[PDB]
C-alpha cells in the first residue's frame, strides 16, 4: 500500500466489508436505543456508500481497476466479519461499528500520507474529507456509551 | 359482501379504540426514552387513522354505514382501554403498543381471509398492506424490548 | 391555584374528541351537491380539531393535570350529543350540524379564555383565545356557504 | 397462459383512450353550477386515465404484447360510446355520463383482475386492483355528490 | 414617435384595474350563498391577477416615462367603472354576473390597449394588453360556464 | 369611534388608503437606495394587504359591512393623499412612509383599546399583532434615516 | 370564423399527434431508447398543453371542439398506420420530425388566419406553439446529423 | 466612561438580553460536553433548544430597541448582569445531570419571562407583553418534555 | 427454498452478489452511451437496495436470521462474479445486467408462489411488486439491444 | 432568412461583449451600494446569458451558423471594452451599465424590425420580451441614478 | 502530541464568541443609509461566525480537549475587544469596525493553518483554510463597499 | 503572491476560452448522442463559469486585476479556438472537449503548485477542487469513447 492507487483499492475492499458489518448491526440490533440507532445505521452506509464512490471513481480516473467481487472484497480487507447474532447487546454493537471507524480512519490517515508523499494532491483531499466526517462519528458514538473519542 | 363490510366496520371501531390507546400513551409517557417515544406514538397515530381512511371509505363505497359515534366503536371494538397512569414503565408502555398491534394485524389476517372468501379484492389489499406495516412495527418495537418479534 | 384552568382544558379535550367524531360523521355520510368541496373540508376541519386537542391536552399535562384519555371519558364529560350516523340528512342539514358544533367550541372557548384570566393563566389563555378566533372564522364562512350571517 | 392477461390489457388500451376522450368532452363543454368544481376535477381525472393507460400499456409490452395505438383501433376495440359534444347537457346529467364511464372501467378492471388472479400475470392483477379500488371510490364520490348511494 | 396614446391607454388601465380589484374585494367580502368556499378564494385569485396586470402595466407607463395615477381619488374619477355599496343580499350567481361585467369591460379596454399601442409601433406595450386579454377572456368563459352560458364575447 | 366594528372598519379605509400610498412611493421612487426601498414597498404593502385580510375578515364575521369602495376608503380615511412627483427625494419618502406608519400604530392601539373595553379579545389580539410588526418597522425605516425609533 | 376553424383544424391534429407519438414511444427499440423513449413522454405533454390552449380558446371565442376520436381522425391531415417494433430509432425520430413539420406548417396557417382577423389572442397561442416544435425539430434533426431545414 | 446605569419594561427586556446570552452559553456547553446515554437524541436537542433561545433574544433586543432603549451587547455586560451562573465544563456529567441543569435555566426563564409579563401588563405595553408570554408557553412545553424524560412531574 | 423464509434469505444472497455486478458495470463502463449508462447503473444499485431493504427486514420480522457476511453472500447466491474489465462492451455489459435481472426476477417468481402457498400475503406483494419493477426495466434494457423483453 | 439570421448573430456576438463587459462591472465595483449592486450584475448577466441561448439557438434552428469564437464576438460587435479600472465610481459603472442596455434596446428593435419585415414572427417575439425587460431595467438603473429611464 | 492545534482551536472558539458579540452590537445599534442591507447582512456573518464555532469546538472535542464554555473563558481568552454599543457611530465605522474583527480572524485563521500543518493534523487545518477563505472574500467585499482595496 | 496571481489570472483567460469552445461544441453538435451531449455542455459550461467566479474573486481579494475584455482573454489564454463547423463528427466533437479539459487539468496542477510554493493555502484548495472535477469528466468523456482516461 505505497501507492495511492493501491491505498484506494485497499478502501475498495475495506469500505465494502465496512458496509456488510454496518448492515449485520443494522440488522440484527436489538436493545432500549434501537430505535434511534437502527435508522443511524443507514446513515452511516450512506457515509460509506459515498466515500466508496469517491474513492473508487478516483481510482478509477487514475487508471486504476477497482476491487469489484465479494472474493475481492474479503480477501483483501483487514476486517473480519462474524455470523449475525440478535443477542449482541446495543452497548457491543456500538462498539463494533466504533472498532469498525477507528480501522477505517487508521486506514484514511494511511491513505492521506500515501498520497502526500506521492504529491496526489486531488486524492489525498479525498481521504483527508473521509477521515474528517469518521473521526466526527467515532466522537460522537464514544460520546454516547460515556466515553471520549480516543482518537 | 356482508361478511367484508362487518370486518371494514370492526376495523373501524378497533382502529378508533387503538387510536386512544396510543393517545393515551402519549401523553402518560414518563421515564428515559420519552424524546424519541412520545413523538413516534403521533406517528403511529398519524398511520393508524390512514388505515381507518381507507377502511372507512372503502365500508362506504360498498354500501355500507360506517360506526360513527364513541358509543359504536367502545362497544364494538375487543380493545379495552383503562384510565391514563403516568406511572406506567416506558417499557410497559411500548409492550402495551405492541400488544394493541398484535391485535389489529390479527385483525388485519381476519380481514384479509373474509374479503379472499368474498372474492373482494380491493379490501383484501387495503388489509394486507396495513398487516405489513404494523408488524414492521411490532418487529422495530420488541427490539427496542431486546426480544424477538414472536410473528 | 389552576384548578379551574386546569378544568376548562379537560373538558376541551372531551369536547373537541366527540366533535372530532362528530365532523368524521359528517364527512363519511355527505349526500348532495357541494359534496366535493365539503367533503374534504371535513378533513381540514378535523386536522384544526386534532390542533387544538394537542395544545390544550399538552397544556394540561404541563400545569401538572390527567387529561381524558379514552372513549368512554370523552364522551360521559362532554357536552355535545352523538347520534347514529344516516345518509339521509341533506347536505346543508350537516353543515348546520358544524355550525352547531363550532358555535359550542368557540363558546367553551371563550369560558376557557375567562377561567384562565381570571386565575391569572395567560398562556392558557392565549391557546383559548387563538382557537376562537379561528373557530369563529369557520363559523362565518359555514355560514356564508348557507346563505346566512355568521351570528356570533 | 399469458393470452387472457395480454388481450385484457390491451381492451383497457383502448377503452381508456376512449375514456379519456369522453373526459375531456365532458371537461370541455360543461355549463351549470358546480363547473368550477368539477371542470379541474375532469383534469385529474383523465390524468389518472392516463396513468393507468401508461402502466397498463407498458406491462403488456413487458408480457410480449403489441399494443392498439392509433384512434381506429381504439374505437373500434373499445366497448364504450361516443357521441357529439353538446354545451346543453346539465351538469348533474354530464356527472351521470362520467359515473357510467367508471362503473364500464371498474367491470372491465375487474375483468383484468379475473384473468390474473391466480392464471395469468400476477403483476398485471396488482396493476387492475389498484385501479378498480380508485375508480371505485371515485364512483362513490360522484354519486354522493348527485345524492346517490355508489350503487357498486 | 409620441406614445402618448399608448401611455393614456396604460393610465386608463391603472385606474380601472385599482377599481376593477376594489369591485373583488366587495364581492369576496359580501358573498354569501351556495358556492362561497369555492368562489370566495376564487376571488383573492382574481385580485391576485388584476395586481399582475397592474404591476405590469404601470411599470411600463413608468418606462415610456409617463406618470401613473396613484391616489383613490384619481383612480375613481379616471375610471369607467361605477361602484355601488356593498351588500349581503345579492346572490351568488349575482355576483359572478357582476364580475363577469367588470372582465368583460377590462377585455374590451385591453383590446383598446392593443389596438393604440399596434398603431404608435409600441410592441411591448401591446404584448402586455395581448396577454392579459387573453387571460381574462378564458375566465369570462368560465364564469359563463358557471353561470350556464356562452363566452358570448 | 366607538366599537370593535368601528374601529375595524377606520382600519380597513386606513389601510386601503395607506396602500395607495406605498404604491405611489414604489411607482414615483428614483435617488439612490431605490434598488433596495422599491421592492422593500412591495413588502410592505404586501403586509398592509394581509391587516387588511385579517381585519376586514374579522369585521364580517362581528357581523359588520366593511367599507368596499374607493369613495368610502378616501372619505373616511384620516390619511391624506397628493399627487405623484418623480421629484420627491428617497430620504422624504420614506419619511413619509414613517409617518404613514406612525398613523398606523396609532389606530392599532386605539382598536387595542376599544376591543380591550368591549371584552373582543380576538379582535384585541388582531390590533396587537399588527402594531407589533408596524412598530418594529418604524424602528428599521428610522433606522436608515439615522433617526431614533422615537414611538 | 376562420380562426375558430383553424383551432378546431389543430385540435384533431394535434390528437391524431398524440396517438403518433405514443405508438413510438411504446414500440421503440434501438440505441438510443434510453434517451428517446422519455423524451415522447415529454412531447406528448407538450402537445397535450397545446391541445388545451387551442381548445380553450376555440370554446372562449364560442366554438365547438371536435371531442370523439372519430372526429379527430377523420379531420386531421396526419395519417396513422399499425403499430411495429420493427422500425429502427432513425425512422422513429424522422416520423417524429415530419409530424412536426406539419403542425409547424399548421400554426403557421393558423397565425396567418388569425391575423388577418385580428384576433391577436389566437395569433400569439399559434406563434408560441410553433417556436418550441421548431426548436425540436432542430434538436431531431441534430441527432439525425441534419441541418433543421425548416 | 461608566458601566451602564442601573434602572419598567425596557430593564425587564435587558435582564432577558442577559440571560438569554448566558442562558445560550449553558446550552453549548451542556451539547458539547455531552456523554452518556441518550447523546444522540440530546446532544442535537441542545441544538434546537439554542436555536430557539437566539429566537427570544432577537425578539426581546429588537423590542428594547424599539422602545428606545439599548441592549447590553458584550459579554461582560451579559455575564455581570445576568441571573444565571455559569461553572466550567466537565464531561464527567450523567444525561440526568446534564438535562436536570437545562431544566434548572428554564425555569429561571419562564420565571423570567412571567416578570416582564406582570410588568408590560401593569405598564400597558401589550407588545412586549405579548414576546413574553409566546415565550413563556414554549420553555414550559419544554420543562415539561425534559421533566417527563426524567420520569418526574413537571412541577410548573 | 422451501418456506418464505428460506426464499427471503436467497434473495438477501443474490441481491447482494446482483449489487456487487451492478457496481462492477458502473465501474468499468466503456462505450457510446456511458454517459446514460452509468448512472443508470446508480439508479438500478438503489432499487436493488430498495429490493433488499423489503426483503431482508421481512425475513427479521418473520423470526428469521439474514446472511450477513460477504461469505454467507458468496457461498449462497446462485450468481457467479468474474474479475472486472473494461475491455468489455456496452452492449455486453447491458446483456450481462439482463441476465442478473432475469435470475432475479425467477427468484421473485419462486417467492411468490412458496409465499402464496404458505398464505403469506405481505411476503406475496412484496415479491410481486419487486416483479414487477425488475420485469420493467428488463423491457427498458432489451429495447435499448433492439429486441424483444423475452420475460 | 438572411436578415433576421444577420440581427439574430448581430445579437449573438453583442451579448457577448455585454456580458463581458457586466462582469468587469461586478468584479471592479467600488462604492456605497456595492453589496446591492455586485450581486444585481449576475442577475443581469444570467439574464444576458438567456437572450443569447435564445437568439443562438433560434438562429441554428433557421438554418444560420452563430459567431462562436472570442475573436468573431469582439470584431462583430458594436460596444466597445476597456480596460478594467477600480476607481470609477458606483454611480459611473451604472452609468455605463445603461449605455450598454440602451444599445441592447435599441439591437432589439432592430431585430424586431426585420424579422417583421420577413414575416418570422418567432424571431420577433424572442427580440420583443428581450426588449421589455432589458428596457425595464433601464428604467430601475436610471431611477437608481435619480433620472428618468429616457428611452 | 496535538497540544498546538488544540489551543489554537481553543483560541477560536474565544475569539469566535467575542466576534458573535460583536457583530449582534453592530446588527443592533446600526443606523445610516444602508441600514436595509447590512443589518440583515450582520445576521448572515453571525451564522456564518456560529458555523466555524461548530466546526472547530467539535474538531477540539473530537481530538480531546475542552473547549471554553463560559462567558468568562471567551472573554479572557480573546484578543478582541467590546466597547459599549453607541448609536451614534456611523454605518462606515461600523463596517470598518467588522473589517477589523475580519482580519484578525483570517490571521488567526492563518495561525491555525500553520500550527495544525506543522503538527501534521490535515483535518484541522482543511478547517482553517475554509474559514480563512470565506472571511477574506467578505473583506473584499466590506472593502469594497467602503471602497477600498482589500489591503489583505 | 504575484505568481499566484498571474496563474489565476492565466485561469481566467483560458477558463474564458473554453467557455466559448465549450458553447462552440453546443450549438454545432451534429449526430447520434446530440440529445444527450448537447445539454452537457450547458452542464460543463455552468462548472467552468462556477472556476471562473472562484479564480476571479480570488485574485480581487489578493488585490490582483483580473483580465475582463475578450482582447484580453483571447492573447492570454494557450487555447486556440477555430470557426464552428456543423461537420466535424460528435465523437471528434467530444475528443475536442477532451483536450480542452486535459489543458485545464494541467492548468490547474500548475496553479496548485504555484500557490503552495508561494504559501498561499486557499488559491491551492480552489485549483485543487478544480482539478479533481475536470478529472473526473475527462474519465467519463473518455468512458463515452471507450477508452482509458490516461491523465
Ligand atoms: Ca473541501
Ligand atoms: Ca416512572
Ligand atoms: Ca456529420
Ligand atoms: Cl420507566
Ligand atoms: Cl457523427
Do not use: C
Not at 445505521?41 to 471513481?57: F, K, Q, R, T
Request: no cysteine; aromatic share 10%.
Amino acid at each position: 500500500l505505497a501507492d495511492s492507487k493501491a491505498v484506494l483499492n485497499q478502501a475498495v475492499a475495506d469500505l465494502s466489508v465496512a458496509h456488510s458489518i454496518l448492515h449485520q448491526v443494522h440488522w440484527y440490533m436489538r436493545g432500549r436505543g434501537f430505535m434511534i440507532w437502527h435508522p443511524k445505521m443507514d446513515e452511516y452506509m450512506e457515509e460509506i456508500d459515498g466515500y466508496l464512490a469517491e474513492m473508487s471513481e478516483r481510482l478509477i480516473t487514475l487508471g486504476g481497476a477497482p476491487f469489484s467481487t465479494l472474493k475481492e472484497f474479503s480477501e483483501n480487507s483487514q476486517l473480519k466479519e462474524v455470523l449475525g447474532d440478535y443477542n449482541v447487546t446495543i452497548e457491543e454493537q456500538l462498539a463494533r461499528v466504533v472498532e469498525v471507524f477507528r480501522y477505517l480512519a487508521a486506514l484514511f490517515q494511511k491513505g492521506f500520507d500515501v498520497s502526500d508523499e506521492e504529491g496526489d494532491s486531488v486524492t489525498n483531499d479525498i481521504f483527508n474529507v473521509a477521515k474528517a466526517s469518521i473521526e466526527k462519528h467515532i466522537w460522537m458514538l464514544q460520546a454516547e456509551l460515556g466515553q471520549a473519542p480516543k482518537l
